[PDB]
From a paper:
The structure consists of two basically identical long α-helices, closely associated with one another and aligned in an antiparallel fashion. The structure is clearly a natural dimer; it is not a consequence of crystal packing. On the other monomer, closely opposed to the stack on monomer A, is a different stack of hydrophobic side chains from the carboxy-terminal half of molecule B. This stack is Leu53-Val49-Phe46-Trp41-Phe42-Met38-Leu34.
In humans, the plasma concentration is about 6 mg/dl. This small protein is remarkable for being the most positively charged protein in the human body, with a lysine content of 17%. The protein has a high affinity for lipid surfaces, particularly chylomicrons, and both HDL and VLDL particles. APOC1 had long been known to be a crucial player in the transfer of lipids between particles and the general clearance of lipids, but its mechanism and the manner by which it bound to lipoprotein particles was poorly understood.
Residue numbers in the entry:
A (entry chain A): 5 to 55
B (entry chain B): 3 to 55
The structure:
């Protein structure tokens, strides 16, 4: 059963890496959306108070 | 187009998770086969030993 249990460990590492990836994608998305929001808000404040 | 990029990676990650689970089920299917192949061969061996005797 050597090739089988080797494949089972493989499936489990894959599953864990997929979930890790998803979490990092969402944290990056949160980071990017806050960057864009902050910058846009700043620019609007700039625009409303000239230079 | 960053938005479409992160979304595509989200979709990839979700599918990879699903395929990993399917892989594990396929492995348990082969496990069943291997165990039965052993049970059949061993049992037949005994049939021979018991009778050839």
């Amino acid at each position: 059963s050597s090739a089988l249990d080797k494949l089972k460990e493989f499936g489990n590492t894959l599953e864990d890496k997929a979930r890790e990836l998803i979490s990092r994608i969402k944290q990056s998305e949160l980071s990017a959306k806050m960057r864009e929001w902050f910058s846009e808000t700043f620019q609007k404040v700039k625009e409303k108070l000239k230079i």
